[PDB]
Amino acid sequence: TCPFYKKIPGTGFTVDAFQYGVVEGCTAYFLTHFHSDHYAGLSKHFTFPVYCSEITGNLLKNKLHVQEQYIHPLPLDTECIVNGVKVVLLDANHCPGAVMILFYLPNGTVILHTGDFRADPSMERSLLADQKVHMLYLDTTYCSPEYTFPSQQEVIRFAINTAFEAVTLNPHALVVCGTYSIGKEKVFLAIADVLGSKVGMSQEKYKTLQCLNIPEINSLITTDMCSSLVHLLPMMQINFKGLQSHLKKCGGKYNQILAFRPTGWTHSNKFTRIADVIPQTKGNISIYGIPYSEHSSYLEMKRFVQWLKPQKIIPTVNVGTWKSRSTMEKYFREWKLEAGY
Ligand code: NI
């Protein structure tokens, strides 16, 4: 049964609730972004409206095969009427096509649902700047002060440098990058760019990328592996047994792999900076973990919520245990008392 934090009061709207069957009363099913926890349940056989971004729509049509009539894409940053309710989509700074949604209720209440987001100061000069927000459905993935990580730009610096070093030292080395969903495209796009290559990938992954409206994308990616010295692989596959295996397949064209595993937080964030990172090493294969996050750090989340001064906050992540819920409320109280709302 659909949980209360997936429903919007005073509407027939639900958010990211596709895995329950029909929700009685639900006229519209919003999808924040194309990640399988949030979309679990959609197929070709959905005959209710879905509202989502254009990019999310392309992925629904081409990867799950939903029928063009039932996909209502909406532009961002545009006041749009949806069954006589004003809504806006705003960029969530998560993965491609990920949005937050502003709901303007008839009674005067305003609700922001962040889906998955990485809070950023540029959001403070968006449409949100213009009016008060009474309720906040918040991505709480990293709502605990231990969760720090660097800026995406810091991380992209590290990567561009590492890769470019090795390839210039050894011109027969291959860069690999791990992946299992959309998100984090800037890692491989940046590396390839510095190396003067295209990124090479399987057919399915090429298909997923061609739906994302990246400009000039035809110049940046290929399905021809031979022709490319930045490869993508399944994140399952990024290990010594699977990388050795893959190094076979290239047929003596490269004598060294240098992989990157973009991860979120790991406990080695607690004691080690980005400029002081190292890889595991079993012979000629070197696997880097790099904490490129597409979720808010604790500080980033803290600032956003302290600027927004919501009258009420509804967690959407880590809500499944009483301890997590309790720990989160405490932080919400501190923020509110610090900030005087
Ligand atoms: Ni996500």
Swiss-Prot record:
It is found in: Nucleus. It comes from the Eukaryota. Induction: During mitosis. The mRNA encoding this protein contains an internal ribosome entry site (IRES) in its 5'-UTR. This 5'-UTR generally suppresses translation while specifically promoting expression during mitosis, when cap-dependent translation may be impaired. Changing D139N: Impaired nuclear focus formation, reduced interaction with PIAS and increased sensitivity to cisplatin. Expressed in brain, heart, kidney, liver, pancreas, placenta and skeletal muscle. Belongs to the DNA repair metallo-beta-lactamase (DRMBL) family. May be required for DNA interstrand cross-link repair. Also required for checkpoint mediated cell cycle arrest in early prophase in response to mitotic spindle poisons. Possesses beta-lactamase activity, catalyzing the hydrolysis of penicillin G and nitrocefin. Exhibits no activity towards other beta-lactam antibiotic classes including cephalosporins (cefotaxime) and carbapenems (imipenem). Binds constitutively to TP53BP1. Binds CDC27, which is itself a component of the anaphase promoting complex (APC). Binds PIAS1. This is DNA cross-link repair 1A protein. The chain holds residues 700 to 1040 of 1040 of the full protein.
